[PDB]
Design a protein around this ligand. Structure first.
Ligand SMILES: O=C(O)c1cc(Oc2ccccc2)c(OCC(F)(F)F)nc1C(F)(F)F
Length: 135
């Protein structure tokens, strides 16, 4: 039945963001996409069915969805429209998501902290923190 990844399951809404514009600059997102993406207030819906985890993000800007098995690489289309190769693992209760494309890498960590789901994104020393709460 239960799995430790079950504390991520649910419907989550973005409540705060820090330095996301600069993170997007470092990833290579252009001006217009940064402005519109930075405005959005996505909801993230996280579900598990057997070994498959699904993370859906719905917003006024873009909708994105990934389904994956921990430790098994997959192809992802990001919200900013990169085509990346991704691997997601669980390390000490933290979901660690690495995206690789064009010789570049970014890492997105998702952790449960109190009643929050905290998303920490890093690229070449630039970090952003985005905090989600239950919807
Ligand atoms: O989960 C996040 O909030 C999040 C959201 C992203 O894009 C959006 C933004 C607004 C609405 C819908 C999707 C995003 O896009 C990749 C980017 F940032 F490179 F553009 N990356 C992340 C994250 F890095 F942190 F995972």
């Amino acid at each position: 039945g239960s799995h430790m990844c079950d504390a991520f399951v649910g419907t989550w809404k973005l409540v705060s963001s820090e330095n996301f514009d600069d993170y997007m600059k470092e990833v290579g997102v252009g001006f217009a996409t940064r402005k519109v993406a930075g405005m959005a207030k996505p909801n993230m819906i996280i579900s598990v069915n057997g070994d498959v985890i699904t993370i859906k993000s719905e917003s006024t800007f873009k909708n994105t969805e990934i389904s994956f098995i921990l430790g098994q690489e997959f192809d992802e289309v990001t919200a900013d429209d990169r085509k990346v190769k991704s691997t997601i693992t669980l390390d000490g209760g933290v979901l660690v998501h690495v995206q690789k494309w064009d010789g570049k890498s970014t890492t997105i960590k998702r952790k449960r902290e109190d009643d929050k789901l905290v998303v920490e994104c890093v690229m070449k020393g630039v970090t952003s923190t985005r905090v989600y709460e239950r919807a």
